[PDB]
Amino acid sequence: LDLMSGILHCEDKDYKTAFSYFFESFESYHNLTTHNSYEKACQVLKYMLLSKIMLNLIDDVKNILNAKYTKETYQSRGIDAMKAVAEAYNNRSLLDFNTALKQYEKELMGDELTRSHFNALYDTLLESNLCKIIEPFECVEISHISKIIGLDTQQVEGKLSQMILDKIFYGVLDQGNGWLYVYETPNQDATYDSALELVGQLNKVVDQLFEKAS
Amino acid sequence: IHCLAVRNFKEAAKLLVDSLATFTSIELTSYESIATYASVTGLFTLERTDLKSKVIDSPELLSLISTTAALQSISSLTISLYASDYASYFPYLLETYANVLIPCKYLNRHADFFVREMRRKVYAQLLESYKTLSLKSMASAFGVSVAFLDNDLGKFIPNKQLNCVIDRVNGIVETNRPDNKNAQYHLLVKQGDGLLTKLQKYGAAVRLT
Amino acid sequence: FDKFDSLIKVQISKIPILAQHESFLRQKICLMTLIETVFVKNIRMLSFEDISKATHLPKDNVEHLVMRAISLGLLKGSIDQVNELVTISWVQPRIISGDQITKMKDRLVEWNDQVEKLGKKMEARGQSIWV
Amino acid sequence: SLVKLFTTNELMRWPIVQKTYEPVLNEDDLAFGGEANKHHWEDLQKRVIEHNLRVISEYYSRITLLRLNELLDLTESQTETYISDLVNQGIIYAKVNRPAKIVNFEKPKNSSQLLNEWSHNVDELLEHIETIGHLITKEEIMH
Amino acid sequence: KETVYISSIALLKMLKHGRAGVPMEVMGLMLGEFVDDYTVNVVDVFAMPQSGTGVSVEAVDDVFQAKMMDMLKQTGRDQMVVGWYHSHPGFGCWLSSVDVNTQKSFEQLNSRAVAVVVDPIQSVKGKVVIDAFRLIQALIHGLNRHYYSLNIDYHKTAKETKMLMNLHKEQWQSGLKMYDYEEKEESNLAATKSMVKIAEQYSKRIEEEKELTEEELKTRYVGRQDPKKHLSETADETLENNIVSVLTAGVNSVAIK
Amino acid sequence: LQHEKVTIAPLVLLSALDHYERTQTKENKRCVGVILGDANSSTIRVTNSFALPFEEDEKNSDVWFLDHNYIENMNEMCKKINAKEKLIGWYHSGPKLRASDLKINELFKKYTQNNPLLLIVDVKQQGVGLPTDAYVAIEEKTFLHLPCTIEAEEAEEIGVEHLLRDVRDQAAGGLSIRLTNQLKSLKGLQSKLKDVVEYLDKVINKELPINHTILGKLQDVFNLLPNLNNLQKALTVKTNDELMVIYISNLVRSIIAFDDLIENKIQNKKIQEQRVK
Ligand SMILES: [Zn+2]
């Protein structure tokens, strides 16, 4: 009744209200039968950490890795992963985050929610790093964004497409020369646009006027 | 659903898409049918941010999903759109053409008018972030050969339904669309003269009469 | 520039305090020269060459000369290297001796004439509109 | 001379700095220690770079990545790294036209804002010539 | 929805002290009253002396403060301390964390107290940069994270304004004056959008008017005005305002240069 | 010592006003405070002011009271702020002088040095402009009248501007009227340019002594000439942008006029129709 509410709050993305449930719901299966519930107290520690990993707070993650509380029994595939992914996030080194999407996935592939929020978080990380690498530049040959962000171009411009198209940074990609242009504001002018509407409405009104021919 | 029974989707957009809040099935049809309708019209006339708003986010369609033999297909199309999956777009497009459209007694009549449109959108959506891009990039993406791709764009371009234009010599595609004040200048000049010559024309007629 | 450059040659041997600090005097000249060549010029802009020949300074320093001319407050403005221009937003008001006034009289005569022609030229056009 | 050296806006020229202040710096116990505090001498170099690159942003409207490297005694990877830094903190406004060309330091101003500038210039002008009028009458009376 | 109203004397004393302290930052206190949840009104300001350290908590001087308080009492200026000004010359308008802690030291006096950042140097004869806001370019510091922005307006008495009028005597200079351009951008825009708006109204009157008699039409439309007259009307202001607008600049460029 | 022209910043105006309506002082009484600025040179630059509590002796005051302790308590509490604003003189907002004025100025000679300046702010404004009037006291000992001005320092330039943005006039006069007002203004400028030219002649010829204060202002006139983000294309883009609105507006007139032709032609058709019978 708790951790499920923590789950729904991982659906509504509030992770403080979430950990509110995950902590206690961990404590229960902690002190309880332990027969098969070593694993059901092994489950919630994860989401407890998903909360923090989403919340950027690695101090409380240090707090979560302490031998007796969990590790003493629970040192296992779970902890190395979510740690490395966590400070991997706060360092914002995408190659690291990727490698931790490689060698830790033995759980991540199995646990759906975890892996989900890591795909989300991974996105909203790569987004950010992009938004930081472009703004000092215009006409920045896109290979450069690649080697700097340390990732293959094809999915870079794969995303920069998505960002341009999502109105994020206002620029345009020239694939002929392998370039990325950025702009300060929307380049389009509003005034001229309303002119372009007026000409239309008119161009109808004229026809309807001349219909009065009689 | 009448509006849908004719070419007019633009009404069926709001009509159907809000018919999801409440629906009376015993009247005509099942709830998943009308789901497929509101989702099809939605896909068809909805803007990208209001697609995400009103359809991709569905207090309802989520409650259905696999419920039928269509909503999983057509939604498997729409997500492949909104999320920019180009390799997959055409396959799901063909699917829905077969699975949902042609069986629908209302939609089948309109089948082609749908798909033609649903081609354009993607081409449109693919270019919008590019002031130039090379064919083989596109063809590669969609997974068709160039010559057929060129052949397809040639349908839309001269109709000014698509703001591209092609350079075959270099296999390149550049996009002329009205954003930079320049373009919104030229286009305005042309439209203006197009209004003048008309106005003068009728002008002399009513002068002399 | 040149006349000063002549003047220093004699006294520079005479007064030892002048023997030291010749560097200063040189800089200070280059500056004042710059300031004036800007102050007279009708539209204020300069290539780097212009300053070079005017100040007889090889053009690398020319941007050090300009930048230092600003950091003392003498000029405001910007430098465009790509085209090697200097825009000079504005130049400091400074007490003016006799001869320097004359040129001001000139430029002001010009900017009187332009108005002569414009005002006197705008009645003709639009003579049909006046009130 | 050190504090006065970072107050004013002018190019630093690192070597001369190191030469001049080397002895008096190194003598101090906490700041510039024998082997323990040598890590300060890398910072000082950083602050110097940030200083020159901070002032060039003032005067120069455009500059060529070459000449800017020359002025900073750096390399291109370095340069673009420092520009990237400073702009991330919003200390300077500089935008690099990247393909081996040009840093652009002007804050692009909305042309209407350029206008609202030029008007006020005009108005304050006219006010001045007006005063020069009232005076210019007054002196003949006075004289 | 929340806002502050900053009286003229406040703003001028503000910018004066700020411009005077350059290139070091100055601080002072703000005297006013809280109208409702949605408003803070600032009628007065006084200036706080420099400190050896930067603007900070102890920079506020109790002795000085009350010493000023009573001496304003004798003048009837009695008001709460509703906020505190400040200046970040050259750095734009944002609160450093050190600005924040002090802002808290003004939270626990009054929960609605606000922070006002003034920026002397880049505030210039055009737009004046000013900011007021309270806790929870600038986004680097968490504009929305630790704190949040507010809005500002200016109370003006009739007589106040009337003094301000006589500053500039424009009676001779008129006709070379160019009014604010951005304002005629909202003009030349909103005008056009409007013309669009009434275009299809004139369209509906020509179609409906076509198939329905004048006697019937009058009954309907007499309430509002003849959308053909909003075309005939509205086209003008754009026309002549834009022709004087063009000509004025064409003259200022060639004549003044 | 001897000074001539008196300069005033707008903040003493607004300040003194807020003193008036702050203290609710009705016209039969007056408001009083002191003035800080620069008295040294042969003009007097006023900048700042602050309010002074005082009392007048019932009706027809024989005595009065000013608090000198309030003064010497406030003054140094200003000096801690901007030290360069020195106590100069006082002011009463009463529209016209009082008997004790000349008496109390003699008091302020204690707290200032040269010639304590007394100016009168007009808080009613009901008359025409220059609500100030500047006075000193010279021997006998009456008040010499002095000229004044409102000299906006840069901060007050910015402030007064930003506050008076909205009050700017509509000027509904027809197009011909405006276009006329302009050419009038141009000729005016032309004339003034004459004036300065032949004056400068008189400087290099008539040997009217060099007046620096003017030359400074000429220079300041040059500093403001637009160089002409280049402003040039900044202007071009505008003029294009207006010419658009001019143009499509013209389209709107044209189509309207065409409509009215439709109304004529239809009208004459039905009238001439009826003239049959
Ligand atoms: Zn601060």
Author numbering:
A (entry chain C): 218 to 431
B (entry chain D): 216 to 424
C (entry chain F): 263 to 393
D (entry chain B): 298 to 440
E (entry chain G): 24 to 159, 186 to 306
F (entry chain E): 3 to 141, 151 to 239, 259 to 307
Sentences reproduced from the published study:
Docked on one side of the base is the lid subcomplex, which contains the deubiquitinating enzyme (DUB) Rpn11 that cleaves polyubiquitin chains from targeted substrates as an essential step in proteasomal substrate processing. Rpn11 is an Mpr1-Pad1 N-terminal (MPN)-domain containing metalloprotease of the JAB1/MPN/MOV34 (JAMM) family and forms a heterodimer with an enzymatically inactive MPN-subunit, Rpn8.
We found that the six PCI winged-helix domains associate into a continuous 18-stranded β-sheet, forming an incomplete right-handed spiral at the center of the lid sub-complex. The C-terminal helices of all lid subunits (except Sem1) assemble into a well-defined helical bundle that is centrally positioned within the lid sub-complex, adjacent to the PCI horseshoe and the MPN heterodimer. Although Rpn5 Asn275 is not within range to directly bind the catalytic Zn2+ (~5 Å from the Zn2+ to Nδ1 of Asn275), the cryo-EM density in the Rpn11 active site shows connectivity between Asn275 and the catalytic Zn2+, potentially corresponding to a coordinated water molecule. While the Sst2 structure presents a snapshot of the transient substrate cleavage product prior to its departure from the active site, the positioning of Rpn5 Asn275 establishes a stable tetrahedral coordination of the Zn2+ ion via this catalytic water molecule, inhibiting isopeptidase activity of Rpn11 in the isolated lid sub-complex. Interestingly, in the context of the isolated lid, the Ins-1 loop appears to be locked in this closed state through interactions with the neighboring Rpn5 subunit. The combined effects of the tetrahedral coordination of the catalytic Zn2+ by Asn275, the steric hindrance imposed by Rpn5’s α-helix 13 in the Rpn11 catalytic groove, and the obstruction of the DUB active site by the Ins-1 loop result in robust DUB inhibition.
